[PDB]
Ligand binder design. Structure first.
Ligand SMILES: *[C@@H]1O[C@H](CO)[C@@H](O[C@@H]2O[C@H](CO)[C@@H](O[C@@H]3O[C@H](CO[C@H]4O[C@H](CO)[C@@H](O)[C@H](O)[C@@H]4O)[C@@H](O)[C@H](O[C@H]4O[C@H](CO)[C@@H](O)[C@H](O)[C@@H]4O[C@H]4O[C@H](CO)[C@@H](O)[C@H](O)[C@@H]4O[C@H]4O[C@H](CO)[C@@H](O)[C@H](O)[C@@H]4O)[C@@H]3O)[C@H](O)[C@H]2NC(C)=O)[C@H](O)[C@H]1NC(C)=O
Ligand SMILES: *[C@@H]1O[C@H](CO)[C@@H](O[C@@H]2O[C@H](CO)[C@@H](O[C@@H]3O[C@H](CO[C@H]4O[C@H](CO)[C@@H](O)[C@H](O)[C@@H]4O)[C@@H](O)[C@H](O[C@H]4O[C@H](CO)[C@@H](O)[C@H](O)[C@@H]4O[C@H]4O[C@H](CO)[C@@H](O)[C@H](O)[C@@H]4O[C@H]4O[C@H](CO)[C@@H](O)[C@H](O)[C@@H]4O)[C@@H]3O)[C@H](O)[C@H]2NC(C)=O)[C@H](O)[C@H]1NC(C)=O
Ligand SMILES: *[C@@H]1O[C@H](CO)[C@@H](O[C@@H]2O[C@H](CO)[C@@H](O[C@@H]3O[C@H](CO[C@H]4O[C@H](CO)[C@@H](O)[C@H](O)[C@@H]4O)[C@@H](O)[C@H](O[C@H]4O[C@H](CO)[C@@H](O)[C@H](O)[C@@H]4O[C@H]4O[C@H](CO)[C@@H](O)[C@H](O)[C@@H]4O[C@H]4O[C@H](CO)[C@@H](O)[C@H](O)[C@@H]4O)[C@@H]3O)[C@H](O)[C@H]2NC(C)=O)[C@H](O)[C@H]1NC(C)=O
Ligand SMILES: *[C@@H]1O[C@H](CO)[C@@H](O[C@@H]2O[C@H](CO)[C@@H](O[C@@H]3O[C@H](CO[C@H]4O[C@H](CO)[C@@H](O)[C@H](O)[C@@H]4O)[C@@H](O)[C@H](O[C@H]4O[C@H](CO)[C@@H](O)[C@H](O)[C@@H]4O[C@H]4O[C@H](CO)[C@@H](O)[C@H](O)[C@@H]4O[C@H]4O[C@H](CO)[C@@H](O)[C@H](O)[C@@H]4O)[C@@H]3O)[C@H](O)[C@H]2NC(C)=O)[C@H](O)[C@H]1NC(C)=O
Ligand SMILES: CC(=O)N[C@H]1[C@H]([C@H](O)[C@H](O)CO)O[C@@](O)(C(=O)O)C[C@@H]1O
Ligand SMILES: CC(=O)N[C@H]1[C@H]([C@H](O)[C@H](O)CO)O[C@@](O)(C(=O)O)C[C@@H]1O
Ligand SMILES: CC(=O)N[C@H]1[C@H]([C@H](O)[C@H](O)CO)O[C@@](O)(C(=O)O)C[C@@H]1O
Ligand SMILES: CC(=O)N[C@H]1[C@H]([C@H](O)[C@H](O)CO)O[C@@](O)(C(=O)O)C[C@@H]1O
Ligand SMILES: CC(=O)N[C@H]1[C@H]([C@H](O)[C@H](O)CO)O[C@@](O)(C(=O)O)C[C@@H]1O
Ligand SMILES: CC(=O)N[C@H]1[C@H]([C@H](O)[C@H](O)CO)O[C@@](O)(C(=O)O)C[C@@H]1O
Ligand SMILES: CC(=O)N[C@H]1[C@H]([C@H](O)[C@H](O)CO)O[C@@](O)(C(=O)O)C[C@@H]1O
Ligand SMILES: [Ca+2]
Ligand SMILES: [Ca+2]
Ligand SMILES: [Ca+2]
Ligand SMILES: [Ca+2]
Ligand SMILES: [Ca+2]
Lengths: 388, 388, 388, 388
């Protein structure tokens, strides 16, 4: 109809209720489910759907051997109905590639997929299900993007890309698209020293992205964007409650403008909702691997370098595998506020469960409640032994 | 369009004709059919569909082992086209949980799913396919609901929940929702001593629910609701024709305001159509197990404590497995009256057929005819031996 | 929109072109295809679809054992997209039963399914996907109907039913339905001595049905209906070119008002287009079994007792299995005339191919061309050996 | 809405970006994917889809044995969502036959399928999903058509057919259809000596077809059509950069009006975009077999007999199997120009990979970019060993 505008503020998050779960690996043990990783959730004005990067093979299929690899000519961004598994028969390909983002602007959807060899990748920006714009690699070192939805405001949908090293400074750019066309792009500015896989959400005409500093930071970099002025800033979450993985143990004081040290060249896509006292951080329970998942209310995490938790909720037990996590919200829901939501990728297979030759995942996702709801833990649920 | 209003009375029930049957277990022996239980049927203004609680695995899948259990993080309310089986590819997830209800108000649908551990469950009420309201467990003992459709009148859709003991008094509440929002809730009132899994239908601005007294009653409790005044009453079906299971043999006089004794802490979801002489009771043929199924015309069953059958119809032979049963009607059908319908869950597998490690079911459903139609029996139809 | 009226005459049939073929048995050797028999084709104003009676099991499924039987509680009328196979995932159940008919009146569709034991069957007439009317068996001996589409004119859709003996006189009735409601019914009149499984088509406000005299006739009975006056007549195809099966060899003179003798208590559903010189007869090539299929132009077959062929077209070689055949036309096609179409059921399995324990079929269908097209033969195409 | 008119010129082709890829053979190793060959892509005003000729069997199905053969009664033109594989459950049959073409005129789609024995084939032209016209074989020797989309202008959609020898002069005709009806047909004129399987595209009210001279030419014949005057001409691509296969090595001077000699009675469907300096040629890398694939910018290829490459892009490595290739464009995309696109059939199985008894393929397709994008190679991706 008309372009959506971020006119609401976030609803108060007093807990998280269950939103969607596809049990993909369980069901896929005996049905035609595509192998995936790097999933997310994204809404249209009339429907919310699960997204991910297919590996172009079923889990039980012999071609599942080797799916631990991240980039191949057989991956594609696919979307499918909420809480269903990604099957060969119900999955809709948005675009071909090994890194992606997607978001609805209120009128139609924009999806971006990057493909190519490491030194010659290119992104093709689709809008209304047609290719419109293409962008060639600028640093010739794995052009890559969000792996979760972008956010739009009055037709302007900013997207964060990174090209260059994963273990040293790289070239991050913020592109501002409108109807699949480039209105403007900036180089990364601010104090964030390395940016990868940003998780974004918007409220009151401002887009907040919680990303990952793969190079040095165990605290997360944050990019805040003004989609009207088409400008941005960057810093790190000040809080001592560190949210990357692997990471060192929590200190008592964090860092606001530098990576918090202790772990180099590694990390996991994550997210956060930074809204003063209504601030919640997501993170794996384990400091060593993508194991477990919890949400922690850390008032003023973004700006208070001594902020510690005041409430929390376990999403996945530390005895269960987790993975990537990101933000999304239904901007077309009724009501006076935007209800914060997120998903957790539940990785199964390699490298942690190597008795199988594949790597895939399932999705669990929650949204906020103003009530103080009881908690449950939500594991993938599959028995690897069955696949043997 | 506009909210539906219960303006018609029930059609005269002179017999029951076949409405839908999915033959899920038969077909699922060699195709991707989800394991389910707790099914029901519910209509939208333009389509009627089968509903049930998936177990998050196919019947032939190895994860089917253990599906006798009622609550896990892998269940979800799914709906699928009428008389089709619940397949991985055609099933639509309404919400995640292990207990549910759902109904269309004329404009859009409201679905409710409860999930959680036993001592910390929570219900999330979805409307127009979006989460709108959440309710935390109030007795910390398996918050649970209908397991069949709710009914709406002018936007108001009452739902019956129970939290607390299954073998002693519990806390039953009647919530009145409008557009997924809580307008009001009452504690159970009346003479019913325990309420679980209510089967409801509406006619002439009144909603009648035939539930189950798991604690002591072999006769069924009945809750009648006025969705305008948003008030209700409760009592038991007076009739000596006892309809729970297991149950003692039929007496010659029943009980109107107390559970009819003889069987404690057990039962099965059931239903009835209470409409003076146009009254029909459904029940298993066996008094010991969920075996067989029949419909009995028992004039004035609700208010006559000596009422006995005047006509009847066998639905399932006593040599075939049955299970839960509930009411639904197509409130958007043409004509001057509402045609009473019901479904019977045909349970296969554990605990009765333990040569297999799973428990699932198929659905058979009928609606009333003003004709006096010949009868057939409708079994599940699957041979367990094939699954061995 | 508005009810369709049969205002056109038939197009000149100079040959038959290929219309649809699903290759169901071939494909079903390795995919989830439902076992069927008694198929047909029927159009809506915006789409034409394949129909048949499912057996409630896949072909490869173990429950396929025993599908040679005609009536069970596991059958249902299902429809699916043109030329696709009937799969568990794309098949839409119209109604539950073991004998059926269906037709679109221009506004919406009416489907009829009969179910029950032999001595207590009942038909339930659905309209706009809702049950509207029910008719109980009147002779208590396998109430049965067309097994192909009915035809409508100004909302009136006549249907032919038979109840009683298959090897002696029976009670055939012609029901005239409008919006699923019975406007009137007549007993069979005319000279036809036994009627079963009528194949109908309409043109210029008249409906012609070519049926089967199971009792004594090797020539086909024909019922012509006036859907305005709601009256009909009956006789046999006069032609010596006999079209039932099994049958005696062709004589030089046929019978207009009596069954042509030589074969008792047997036959196959068939059809014809009776339009003066533009008359075409369909029949198996074999006089002994449902083997092969051909179309023969027999000018004035209906009224000329010495009429013999003037042109012809082989549809299926005598070295391939055939089966039932019936008429349908797209009454919503563009142009000045109705293009005659028909389908042939290609039966595979029992009783002829008994190395397998099942019986199913595929569908091949053609429509007329005003050109004189070259011919091909269209077999099922499956190798039974693969199923062993 | 209104008939589409070719009012735009082609966009400048500076490179090719990835558009769609279905990975059909990989996925089909463990899922219900139909065996195909002769694929293409074609757009409607609201969606672009993959097309191909099914073999009427799954790849893993036993009936896949023998699919190396080109014509059988089990083939059909099927279409399915872009970048999905052709599965039994998501494939839509357009028409039955072993040679086809299809195109949307802006209002609705016209699809053509030819079926029959070699000496008696016939084409049936469908429009708006209904059969409208039929054309009988005129030379009684494998009536055949494009195997890629046709193009329309103001309701007029020209199609190129060939009937007669594959190794000597044949009878090629250009039919001009409007709403499935024949407006006019011409015999082939110009200097092309043999025409088969034309790949067409339209721009500025002119349709260009790059076909194949199976008899003698290693350079490609080109037919240019004026869909208003309904007239055409023909010649060969002048360029020494030969694009058929097998073929001799490239000379330094080509032929404009005669087949370039060196290879008789063989070839592969191919295409080109002839637009002055904005000219690009597609061809297999190997001169001996359907191996590899590349795009070469050959300015003025059509008219310059010494034209050689000025830029290029590898699509498939010479160490990977390729096959047919053809043109299509989204005539309903936004913007001021038509973006050239093409697909490459990636053949797997027989005759090159004979350890399996089947022959099928997957599809890879690209479209032009005005950017100079980095290149990747796009193989089928399946391991034949897995099918053993
Ligand atoms: C039914 O449902 C309800 C609703 O969910 C249940 O009630 C909930 O229960 C939760 C568990 O108790 C509770 O969550 C906790 O909240 C704490 C905050 O509240 C407390 O402190 C505040 C502030 O003073 C008080 O106001 C309040 O009254 C409480 O006393 C959090 O602090 C908890 O998180 C910390 O503990 C968990 C383990 O339990 C860690 O996994 C988590 O990471 C936190 O601790 C680590 O991090 C901090 C910060 O740096 C460190 O200080 C600390 O030592 C830990 O550090 C180590 O571990 C991390 C992680 O592995 C590692 O990285 C680091 O290096 C160190 O190794 C927790 O979130 C809910 O708030 C509460 N909800 C409500 C509404 O009440 C109820 O129990 C259920 N009922 C039943 C019957 O089961
Ligand atoms: C073709 O189709 C038609 C249409 O369906 C067929 O006709 C139908 O046939 C049905 C079977 O006969 C018939 O159903 C019965 O109706 C009885 C009522 O009618 C009779 O009584 C009235 C009232 O006086 C008369 O007016 C009327 O003329 C009849 O005489 C019911 O009473 C029957 O139900 C009871 O029996 C069945 C077993 O047959 C039990 O399963 C059922 O539970 C009922 O009996 C139990 O319950 C009562 C009440 O408390 C007890 O008194 C009794 O002893 C039984 O109790 C034991 O069993 C229960 C259940 O297991 C247990 O819990 C308890 O503790 C005890 O152990 C029955 O419903 C249809 O009405 C009739 N329909 C029509 C339209 O005519 C026709 O036959 C078919 N044709 C062919 C050729 O097959
Ligand atoms: C390319 O395509 C074209 C287009 O299809 C091909 O041309 C077609 O070829 C067809 C086969 O020749 C042909 O079909 C035949 O038409 C005959 C009628 O035409 C002839 O007679 C008329 C009338 O005098 C002449 O005007 C005309 O010029 C012809 O001479 C039919 O009579 C044929 O049917 C009979 O034969 C077939 C076997 O071939 C039987 O299966 C069929 O049942 C008919 O014969 C039985 O029935 C009659 C009637 O009672 C009996 O008299 C007769 O003895 C047979 O009876 C026995 O068999 C039956 C059936 O099993 C059994 O029940 C009975 O008891 C007995 O046992 C046939 O239909 C097309 O018309 C023709 N089309 C066109 C447009 O030309 C062309 O050849 C192809 N090209 C190539 C290169 O292949
Ligand atoms: C990241 O991405 C970018 C973007 O893609 C990469 O850059 C691209 O790199 C491509 C490969 O180098 C390049 O493609 C080539 O373009 C050549 C034309 O450019 C050159 O010449 C022009 C004209 O003078 C100059 O202006 C320009 O500066 C260049 O110098 C083509 O000529 C190339 O094609 C020929 O070679 C390939 C093998 O490499 C053959 O397969 C192809 O068929 C061509 O050669 C055959 O055909 C010709 C013509 O008849 C014969 O003369 C020749 O001998 C060959 O003939 C034999 O082989 C054929 C085929 O098998 C057979 O039939 C015949 O009988 C003989 O046996 C080639 O197309 C892109 O243009 C370039 N793109 C851009 C934008 O720069 C970049 O490298 C990537 N980065 C990294 C780090 O990898
Ligand atoms: C799913 C799981 O087993 N997680 C466990 C992980 C992994 O075993 C290792 O991190 C793999 O290296 O290790 C822990 O010690 C941890 O990190 O807290 C315990 C946790 O329960
Ligand atoms: C929420 C829940 O667990 N419901 C379960 C109920 C309760 O156990 C009883 O109502 C006792 O409260 O009964 C079942 O076990 C049963 O009888 O088949 C199935 C059902 O899933
Ligand atoms: C499907 C079935 O076999 N049902 C039978 C059941 C079960 O065997 C037991 O109730 C299981 O405990 O038992 C009966 O004695 C009964 O209750 O009337 C007979 C009935 O035919
Ligand atoms: C209702 C019914 O059973 N119809 C069956 C009829 C009747 O048996 C005959 O018409 C005798 O009346 O014929 C079949 O057996 C047959 O010949 O293939 C199939 C069909 O299903
Ligand atoms: C498919 C097939 O094999 N059909 C053959 C049939 C059957 O073998 C028997 O009729 C079965 O009884 O028999 C014929 O003699 C015939 O009737 O004309 C030859 C025909 O080719
Ligand atoms: C109608 C038809 O059979 N077309 C076939 C053509 C013809 O054989 C050649 O064009 C010679 O005319 O070529 C193929 O065999 C091929 O080369 O892969 C495939 C295709 O199906
Ligand atoms: C996929 C593949 O293996 N292609 C190879 C082909 C085939 O082996 C033969 O052409 C089959 O005859 O042969 C080459 O010599 C060539 O033609 O350039 C090398 C190329 O790498
Ligand atoms: Ca399978
Ligand atoms: Ca890091
Ligand atoms: Ca009880
Ligand atoms: Ca007969
Ligand atoms: Ca050639």
């Amino acid at each position: 109809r008309d372009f959506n505008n971020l006119t609401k503020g976030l609803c108060t998050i007093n807990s998280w209720h269950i939103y969607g779960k596809d049990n993909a690996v369980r069901i896929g043990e005996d049905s035609d489910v595509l192998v995936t990783r790097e999933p997310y959730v994204s809404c249209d004005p009339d429907e919310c759907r699960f997204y991910a990067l297919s590996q172009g093979t079923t889990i039980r299929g012999k071609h599942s051997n080797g799916t631990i690899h991240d980039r191949s000519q057989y991956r594609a961004l696919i979307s499918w109905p909420l809480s269903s598994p990604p099957t060969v028969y119900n999955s809709r390909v948005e675009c071909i590639g090994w890194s992606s983002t997607s978001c609805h602007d209120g009128k139609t959807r924009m999806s971006i997929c990057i493909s190519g060899p490491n030194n010659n990748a290119s992104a093709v920006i689709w809008y209304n299900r047609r290719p419109v714009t293409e962008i060639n690699t600028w640093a010739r070192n794995i052009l890559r993007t969000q792996e979760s939805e972008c956010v739009c405001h009055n037709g302007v949908c900013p997207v964060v890309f990174t090209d260059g090293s994963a273990t040293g400074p790289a070239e991050t750019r913020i592109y501002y698209f409108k109807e699949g066309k480039i209105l403007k792009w900036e180089p990364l500015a601010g104090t964030a020293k390395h940016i990868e896989e940003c998780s974004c959400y918007g409220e009151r005409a401002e887009i907040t992205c919680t990303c990952k500093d793969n190079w040095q930071g165990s605290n997360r970099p944050v990019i805040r964007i003004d989609p009207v002025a088409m400008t941005h800033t960057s810093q790190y979450i000040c809080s001592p409650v560190l949210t990357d993985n692997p990471r060192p143990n929590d200190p008592t004081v964090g860092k606001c403008n530098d990576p918090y040290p202790g772990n180099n060249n590694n990390g996991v896509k994550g997210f956060s909702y930074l809204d003063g006292v209504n601030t919640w951080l997501g993170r794996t329970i384990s400091i060593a691997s993508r194991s477990g998942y919890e949400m922690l209310k850390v008032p003023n995490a973004l700006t208070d370098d001594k902020s510690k938790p005041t409430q929390g909720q376990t999403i996945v037990l530390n005895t269960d595998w987790s993975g990537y996590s990101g933000s999304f919200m239904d901007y077309w829901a009724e009501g006076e506020c935007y209800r914060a939501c997120f998903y957790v990728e539940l990785i199964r297979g390699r490298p942690k469960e190597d008795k199988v030759w594949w790597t895939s995942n399932s999705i669990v996702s929650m949204c906020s409640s103003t009530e103080f709801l009881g908690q449950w833990d939500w594991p993938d649920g599959a028995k690897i032994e069955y696949f043997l």
